[PDB]
Enzyme design. Structure first.
Site, short mmCIF file in Angstrom:
data_model
loop_
_atom_site.label_atom_id
_atom_site.label_comp_id
_atom_site.label_asym_id
_atom_site.label_seq_id
_atom_site.Cartn_x
_atom_site.Cartn_y
_atom_site.Cartn_z
CG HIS A 180 60.43 -81.74 23.54
ND1 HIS A 180 59.76 -80.54 23.49
CD2 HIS A 180 59.68 -82.61 22.82
CE1 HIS A 180 58.66 -80.67 22.77
NE2 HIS A 180 58.59 -81.92 22.35
CE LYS B 96 56.47 -83.20 26.07
NZ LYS B 96 55.46 -82.10 26.02
N1 LIG Z 1 56.80 -85.22 23.04
C1 LIG Z 1 56.61 -84.88 21.77
O1 LIG Z 1 57.51 -84.78 20.94
C2 LIG Z 1 55.16 -84.60 21.39
C3 LIG Z 1 54.83 -84.47 20.05
C4 LIG Z 1 53.51 -84.25 19.67
C5 LIG Z 1 52.51 -84.17 20.63
N2 LIG Z 1 52.84 -84.30 21.98
C6 LIG Z 1 51.78 -84.21 23.01
O2 LIG Z 1 50.61 -84.91 22.53
C7 LIG Z 1 49.52 -83.97 22.55
C8 LIG Z 1 48.46 -84.24 21.49
O3 LIG Z 1 49.02 -84.15 20.18
P1 LIG Z 1 48.12 -83.88 18.88
O4 LIG Z 1 47.08 -82.90 19.19
O5 LIG Z 1 49.04 -83.59 17.77
O6 LIG Z 1 47.48 -85.33 18.59
P2 LIG Z 1 46.18 -86.25 18.95
O7 LIG Z 1 45.83 -86.19 20.38
O8 LIG Z 1 46.41 -87.58 18.35
O9 LIG Z 1 45.00 -85.56 18.10
C9 LIG Z 1 44.41 -84.34 18.53
C10 LIG Z 1 43.22 -84.20 17.62
O10 LIG Z 1 42.26 -85.22 17.93
C11 LIG Z 1 40.96 -84.60 18.00
N3 LIG Z 1 40.08 -85.25 19.00
C12 LIG Z 1 40.17 -85.16 20.33
N4 LIG Z 1 39.17 -85.84 20.90
C13 LIG Z 1 38.45 -86.38 19.92
C14 LIG Z 1 37.32 -87.21 19.87
N5 LIG Z 1 36.72 -87.71 20.94
N6 LIG Z 1 36.84 -87.57 18.65
C15 LIG Z 1 37.42 -87.17 17.53
N7 LIG Z 1 38.49 -86.39 17.54
C16 LIG Z 1 39.02 -86.00 18.71
C17 LIG Z 1 41.17 -83.14 18.33
O11 LIG Z 1 40.20 -82.34 17.65
P3 LIG Z 1 39.31 -81.24 18.40
O12 LIG Z 1 40.19 -80.31 19.13
O13 LIG Z 1 38.35 -80.69 17.42
O14 LIG Z 1 38.49 -82.12 19.46
C18 LIG Z 1 42.58 -82.85 17.82
O15 LIG Z 1 42.57 -82.19 16.55
C19 LIG Z 1 50.17 -82.62 22.34
O16 LIG Z 1 49.38 -81.52 22.79
C20 LIG Z 1 51.40 -82.76 23.21
O17 LIG Z 1 51.08 -82.46 24.56
C21 LIG Z 1 54.17 -84.50 22.36
C1 LIG Z 2 57.17 -77.86 13.31
C2 LIG Z 2 57.44 -77.06 14.60
C3 LIG Z 2 58.58 -77.66 15.41
C4 LIG Z 2 58.21 -79.04 15.96
C5 LIG Z 2 56.89 -78.95 16.76
C6 LIG Z 2 55.70 -78.31 16.03
C7 LIG Z 2 54.46 -78.18 16.93
C8 LIG Z 2 54.08 -79.56 17.47
C9 LIG Z 2 55.23 -80.27 18.11
C10 LIG Z 2 55.06 -80.82 19.34
C11 LIG Z 2 56.14 -81.49 20.05
O1 LIG Z 2 56.09 -81.70 21.24
C12 LIG Z 2 57.29 -81.89 19.24
C13 LIG Z 2 57.71 -80.80 18.26
C14 LIG Z 2 56.56 -80.35 17.33
C15 LIG Z 2 56.36 -81.36 16.18
C16 LIG Z 2 56.20 -76.97 15.48
C17 LIG Z 2 55.22 -76.10 14.69
C18 LIG Z 2 56.13 -75.05 14.03
C19 LIG Z 2 57.58 -75.54 14.33
O2 LIG Z 2 58.52 -75.18 13.32
#
Ligand SMILES: NC(=O)c1ccc[n+]([C@@H]2O[C@H](COP(=O)([O-])OP(=O)(O)OC[C@H]3O[C@@H](n4cnc5c(N)ncnc54)[C@H](OP(=O)(O)O)[C@@H]3O)[C@@H](O)[C@H]2O)c1
Ligand SMILES: C[C@]12CC[C@H]3[C@@H](CCC4=CC(=O)CC[C@@]43C)[C@@H]1CC[C@@H]2O
Ligand SMILES: NC(=O)c1ccc[n+]([C@@H]2O[C@H](COP(=O)([O-])OP(=O)(O)OC[C@H]3O[C@@H](n4cnc5c(N)ncnc54)[C@H](OP(=O)(O)O)[C@@H]3O)[C@@H](O)[C@H]2O)c1
Ligand SMILES: C[C@]12CC[C@H]3[C@@H](CCC4=CC(=O)CC[C@@]43C)[C@@H]1CC[C@@H]2O
Lengths: 319, 319
Positions: free
Chosen positions: B117, B84
């Site tokens: 992003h 992104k």
């Molecule tokens: N475009 C954006 O602005 C944006 C923003 C935020 C996130 N993202 C993308 O979304 C991805 C995921 O975000 P996220 O990690 O915040 O949220 P998420 O996928 O909703 O939650 C991740 C959490 O769920 C847990 N989990 C995974 N598999 C599981 C299972 N089978 N059972 C129970 N818990 C489980 C993991 O724990 P464990 O590790 O212990 O398994 C982890 O702490 C990011 O890495 C990023 O690539 C994009």
């Molecule tokens: C809050 C933050 C900026 C926004 C980030 C956050 C990590 C997770 C994240 C994932 C995204 O893809 C959107 C931006 C955010 C939400 C960052 C951790 C420290 C930083 O200041």
């Protein structure tokens, strides 16, 4: 979404739906039945349709597909249509003529995959299997490499998005891959593959070359007496297959199909029965355990339901 | 084959694996843990990896991916890598500079999908969130349509196979779709979507435009205290979700994930735990009944775990 609608990568940048629906109509069955079945397959999530010039039903299949495009159920792009080049058009100058007849019949503007039906050329003409008055089959020795170059041009012309082969053995396949000036590699080799003829060597060969194995007679064929020996084993009745199916609370058909998917094969199936069409769509809802795969791998007995004996003693017979 | 490896169509002719693996590393977790997890995800059939310039881990992820290419587990073509564009590179002349840093870091020759992003531009520089000495966030009003044109060129240049956006609202999306001279339409809109914020309107809008909704925080996020309010509801503990999960003998995570897949969303998940990574690969082994989907649809309460308050009062704030 329909998991059987999901796609796998082809070595030319294209993607093919993981489960294909064949269109051959059995000898005593009416050609309009294929229109019924195709519409139902589409309604059930089938997006890959396998046909051929030889099948003489491309007019019917194209009709079923377009009606579904018409009523807004799908777009041309959602459909992956496969057709095959018949042996009588193997001469370089005739390849595109065969394809243009398919296009005219189906009324699709291109075929997604165009493949060489058999690695055997027969004398040009209006009969599929031309024989002399004494029954001798009138074949020719047109080089597959020459017919292949004609296939590449149909791809360059945009008439076929992808090109491949069918019923080729490793030697014939190697012949094309090593051809000098090769521009496009075959994306698949559609061959007979099921529990009694699992094609492990061919599968290994194809994997190393990035050629996918598309299987037919996956469920042990239609046992059409015009081409299947009635004294052949019935695959779906196999004891070991039925025990395993019983163990997963699944049908033998589903277990025979899942086995292929699990080993990397893109399978073709065919059913003109609405209940069975729906049944096959659930093949992703379970998974065979290693031990069970090893069990099924053991059912192999190198048995062909399709001997291609209608090609008599063609010097280029693959089997 | 690995059903979670199967692909769905993008509106530009490309295909994306149906299940994505995120790469953000939690505040107190070591960056080398993402290399572990990525290799395991690959071993388990994950083929779609979501990263970003902001994440500062593209060097690590590219390392995990290439090792798996290097030992022969996959080919570049088998991997779908998403990155992104950060807000500080929104100026047309800086877009490709950001992408070239990603390419240099990952050592991949192109990214399969490159997305904006956030629809908010910040002043160019070396800090992700530039603020003046009094604390004020130093933003800019660069038009998204202008940054979008720069994104189209990266696609024309072959540096990105597909381009899209993230965190855009319908107005911002409409702004780009109606842009005069638009050459390439966004293939997706990656936004927060789960049981408490199901995005039905956005999902409907995207469906009508052939834009896919890629969801993040699908499982209720990582509850990282640096960005998630600790007094927010824990999604996976929801009574209704747990009852339904119990009814299918499945985990809440699997039920929260399946719900998205069933509604046409391409979900992103993330787990650094080997058991849980394996667990998510079985999401195709069951299917929620209409009544159950309607139940889960009712859990919606328009709740965001990601408020983007770190963007203060940017005139272009999407939420
Ligand atoms: N475009 C954006 O602005 C944006 C923003 C935020 C996130 N993202 C993308 O979304 C991805 C995921 O975000 P996220 O990690 O915040 O949220 P998420 O996928 O909703 O939650 C991740 C959490 O769920 C847990 N989990 C995974 N598999 C599981 C299972 N089978 N059972 C129970 N818990 C489980 C993991 O724990 P464990 O590790 O212990 O398994 C982890 O702490 C990011 O890495 C990023 O690539 C994009
Ligand atoms: C809050 C933050 C900026 C926004 C980030 C956050 C990590 C997770 C994240 C994932 C995204 O893809 C959107 C931006 C955010 C939400 C960052 C951790 C420290 C930083 O200041
Ligand atoms: N390239 C080549 O040379 C070549 C050669 C042969 C075939 N093919 C392709 O392969 C396709 C299929 O060939 P095929 O029909 O001979 O073989 P097949 O798929 O192995 O068998 C078809 C038979 O299986 C039955 N069946 C389907 N679903 C079932 C289920 N769930 N349970 C039990 N039975 C089920 C069908 O019966 P019902 O209709 O009653 O359901 C049908 O009679 C052809 O249409 C063609 O497209 C290619
Ligand atoms: C046997 C036959 C020629 C070979 C055909 C067969 C129908 C089924 C079939 C499908 C193929 O794709 C390969 C050729 C075959 C096996 C035909 C039925 C009558 C015709 O003579």
């Amino acid at each position: 979404m329909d998991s059987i609608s999901l796609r796998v990568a082809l070595n030319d940048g294209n993607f093919i739906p993981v489960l294909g629906f064949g269109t051959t109509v059995p000898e005593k069955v009416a050609k309009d039945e294929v229109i019924k079945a195709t519409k139902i397959a589409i309604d059930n999530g089938f997006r890959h349709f396998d046909s051929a010039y030889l099948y003489e039903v491309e007019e019917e299949v194209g009709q079923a597909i377009r009606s579904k495009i018409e009523d807004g159920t799908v777009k041309r792009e959602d459909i992956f249509y496969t057709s095959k080049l018949w042996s009588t058009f193997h001469r370089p100058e005739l390849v595109r003529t065969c394809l243009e007849k398919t296009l005219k019949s189906t009324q699709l503007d291109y075929v997604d995959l165009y493949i060489i039906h058999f690695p055997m050329a027969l004398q040009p003409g209006d009969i599929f299997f031309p024989r002399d008055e004494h029954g001798k089959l009138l074949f020719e020795t047109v080089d597959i490499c020459d017919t292949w170059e004609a296939m590449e041009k149909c791809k360059d012309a945009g008439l076929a998005k992808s090109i491949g082969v069918s019923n080729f053995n490793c030697r014939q396949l190697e012949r094309i891959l090593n051809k000098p000036g090769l521009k496009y590699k075959p994306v698949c080799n559609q061959v007979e593959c099921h529990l009694y003829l699992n094609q492990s060597k061919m599968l290994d060969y194809c994997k190393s070359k990035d050629i996918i194995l598309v299987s037919y007679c996956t469920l042990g064929s239609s046992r059409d007496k015009t081409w299947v020996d009635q004294k052949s084993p019935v695959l779906l009745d196999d004891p070991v297959l039925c025990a395993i199916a019983k163990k997963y609370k699944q049908t033998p058909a589903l277990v025979a199909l899942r086995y292929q998917l699990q080993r990397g094969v893109v399978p073709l199936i065919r059913s003109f029965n609405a209940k069975r069409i729906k049944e096959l769509t659930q093949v992703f809802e379970f998974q065979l355990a290693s031990e069970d795969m090893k069990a099924l791998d053991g059912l192999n007995r190198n048995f062909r339901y399709n001997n291609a004996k209608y090609f008599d003693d063609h010097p280029n017979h693959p089997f």
